[PDB]
């Protein structure tokens, strides 16, 4: 589980450029206010690399 | 469960949005397609198993 992606982005990435900060993503209208739960995602997807 | 029902969903636009307007779901995990995409993307082969 040492390799991770970032599922949830508010807009695309430019070329050659890198994003490690770990802030809350809102996927909805309600806002997150820093809280995971519902309409609030960690943007970080673990591998289940096996 | 062991006999868990299916139906096609084909020929209409589904929205939704009204799932997260209206939603008593604990649960609500997507695997191979972001939450927040589904309104942005077109399928067919809709299957629901109940």
């Given at each position: 589980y040492n390799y991770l992606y970032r599922l949830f982005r508010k807009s695309n990435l430019?070329?050659?450029?890198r994003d490690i900060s770990t802030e809350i993503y809102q996927a909805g209208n309600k806002?997150?206010?820093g809280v995971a739960g519902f309409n609030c995602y960690f943007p970080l997807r673990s591998y289940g690399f096996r | 469960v062991y006999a868990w029902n299916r139906k096609?969903?084909?020929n209409c636009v589904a929205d939704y949005?009204?799932?997260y307007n209206f939603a008593?779901?604990?649960a609500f995990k997507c695997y191979g397609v972001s939450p927040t995409k589904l309104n942005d993307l077109c399928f067919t082969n809709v299957y629901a198993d109940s």
């Open positions: 430019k070329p050659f450029e806002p997150c206010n | 096609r969903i084909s949005s009204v799932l008593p779901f604990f």
